[PDB]
Design a protein around this nucleic acid. Sequence first.
DNA 1: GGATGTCACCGGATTGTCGAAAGAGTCATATGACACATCC
DNA 2: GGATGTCACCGGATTGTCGAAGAGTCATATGACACATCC
Lengths: 121, 126
Amino acid sequence: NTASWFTALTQHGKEDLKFPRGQGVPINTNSSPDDQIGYYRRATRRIKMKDLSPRWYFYYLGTGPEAGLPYGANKDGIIWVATEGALNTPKDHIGTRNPANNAAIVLQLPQGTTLPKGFYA
Amino acid sequence: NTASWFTALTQHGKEDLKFPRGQGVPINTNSSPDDQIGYYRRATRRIRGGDGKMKDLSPRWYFYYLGTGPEAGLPYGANKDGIIWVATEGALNTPKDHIGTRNPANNAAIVLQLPQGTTLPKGFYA
DNA sequence: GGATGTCACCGGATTGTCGAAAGAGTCATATGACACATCC
DNA sequence: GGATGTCACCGGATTGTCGAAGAGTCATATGACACATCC
Ligand code: NA
């Protein structure tokens, strides 16, 4: 169907995901500096029943479950990230991933990127 | 799909089935005096019993009206082993296609009975 | 030997029986009705 | 509530696995394959 292209950051703690002003965009050698902008969206799960650590999935701006929102729109579960010189345009030339055809890229960030307590690179 | 209208006469003895002239046509209340003519045909089968040895069973003679059955092609009297002919006094020598044979799916066999007095060989019983 | 059926136990197998949309071996999947759990 | 899946054991379920795509139970139905029977 539709996936985030970039695995997920797991929230082992209680604090939400947060990034300094130019940090948090997953590395993707197939993308350009213009594309480095998007959002993480939270998804939690309950599995005798137990809620599990939330997963934050990244989606480029204009794609995914919140493709309608513009950068900055305030909504719970949504946090926004951008690299300095990215353009505020929908990234339809990137879109989402079909897991049938494509495995997720293991999400890593440039060495130095600061994470909250409950998250690991 | 095609069978005899009647049950079979079982040959328990050694002599084949035989009838005096004018005897041996099975009773059938749906038939007319013109139809009372046909033949008995012999049928044997050998089964494997509990012994495991193969074994022949007493032969069965099945009646078929003239012009019907496995020997519908034969005319009355034709000499063939296993085939014997019978006819009543004033029967007609014509094929009995209006009687035909029986489909066991739609019709049970009539128990074969003969008019009381009919002479049978020994290995046969009314 | 070469096709066709595979139940019972020759009573009547050219039937009777237990079931049945009739047809009847074994054994391994396939289907389909039905229930509940899960996901949105 | 009203569609949709029923596996594993949350690693990655927004996947991986074993077997061949999809994954519950349970009752028949089918079909390939061997033997017995019938002609
Ligand atoms: Na004829």
